[PDB]
Amino acid sequence: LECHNQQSSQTPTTKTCSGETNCYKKWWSDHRGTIIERGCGCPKVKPGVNLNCCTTDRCNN
């Protein structure tokens, strides 16, 4: 499984997961705007955060 792992609006990059069967994208905002974290897996998140856990290559851009 290949997942995107770049932060926020940075140039897209991906990593090849080592076992995970999900990719994730989590985002929320602060005074500067939207912050986005991407990677392998499907982590538990703090309430109030947006989260997308998907199951296909590069599905979390």
Side-chain angles (χ1 to χ4, degrees):
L1 182 60
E2 181 186 351
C3 299
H4 278 286
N5 66 324
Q6 83 278 4
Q7 292 182 291
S8 306
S9 59
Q10 294 186 306
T11 301
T13 64
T14 61
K15 66 188 295 182
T16 298
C17 310
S18 48
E20 294 86 356
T21 53
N22 285 96
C23 291
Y24 77 86
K25 182 178 182 183
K26 54 184 295 187
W27 68 102
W28 72 96
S29 300
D30 71 349
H31 85 281
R32 228 122 53 75
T34 303
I35 300 173
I36 308 174
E37 296 191 1
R38 303 181 179 76
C40 296
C42 184
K44 185 76 192 307
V45 299
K46 187 70 166 61
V49 174
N50 294 285
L51 174 70
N52 176 188
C53 289
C54 48
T55 56
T56 58
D57 285 343
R58 304 176 295 284
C59 63
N60 66 328
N61 192 38

